[PDB]
């Protein structure tokens, strides 16, 4: 499961970077926010699904 744990770290870092990018997009033009919210949505469900895979 070490691959999943490092993937979880990578997903956390990607979520933080995606939040920072969302703040940048909101700070210059809040009309392409839909794809960034979608990316945060899929990053979060990937994080939660990796936790559910680690649950057994």
């Amino acid at each position: 499961y070490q691959y999943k744990i490092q993937e979880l770290r990578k997903l956390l870092k990607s979520l933080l970077l995606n939040y920072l990018e969302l703040i940048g997009v909101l700070s210059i033009n809040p009309d392409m926010y839909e794809r960034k919210v979608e990316n945060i949505r899929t990053i979060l469900v990937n994080i939660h699904h990796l936790l559910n895979e680690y649950r057994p």
Binding site: K13, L16, L17, Y19, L20, E21, I23, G24, V25, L26, S27, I28
Partner: protein, 157 residues
């Protein structure tokens, strides 16, 4: 832009001559009002009142058929409901213009405050991300560069 300039010139001319026509209508109104208030009952006074109604009807004729005239910006000029009810309330419509353009500047400044607060959040959070995680320096710099692109609609004030 030449067409807009010249048609706004006939806007100004058409509004000025309608000022004249409406003022003439109000002057006809003041004279039949004083006719009612000091009516002597003479047939000459009655015929003068009849001619007053004649001139009122033909002034309304001219301005109504000119409201249906194609050679007119009477239709191209636009009127909303708030200014007409505001004048009906007895209040000065230049205050309506003032409040509306001040609302323009309020929304511009409020959205600009949103943008600058979001920029403060962005660069403070980016600096703290770089300070905490030294391996995120390149992605944060890429994100800041991409979310601060080349300025084409920000260099000008």
């Amino acid at each position: 832009m030449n067409g807009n300039s010249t048609n706004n010139e006939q806007l100004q001319q058409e509004l000025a001559t309608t000022q004249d026509q409406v003022a003439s209508i109000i002057e006809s109104f003041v004279e039949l009002g004083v006719s009612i208030y000091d009516f002597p009952g003479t047939p000459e006074a009655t015929k003068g009142m009849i001619t007053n109604l004649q001139r009122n009807v033909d002034r309304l004729y001219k301005l109504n058929v000119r409201s249906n005239d194609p050679q007119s910006s009477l239709s191209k000029v636009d009127i909303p409901l708030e200014v007409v009810q505001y004048i009906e309330d007895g209040r000065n419509p230049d205050i309506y213009t003032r409040e509306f353009v001040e609302a323009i500047r309020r929304s511009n400044q409020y959205q600009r405050g949103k943008m600058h607060g979001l920029k403060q959040l962005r660069d403070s959070l980016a600096d703290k991300i770089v300070d905490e995680f030294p391996e995120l320096k390149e992605p944060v710099e890429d994100i800041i560069k991409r979310t601060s692109p080349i300025d084409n609609v920000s260099n000008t004030h």
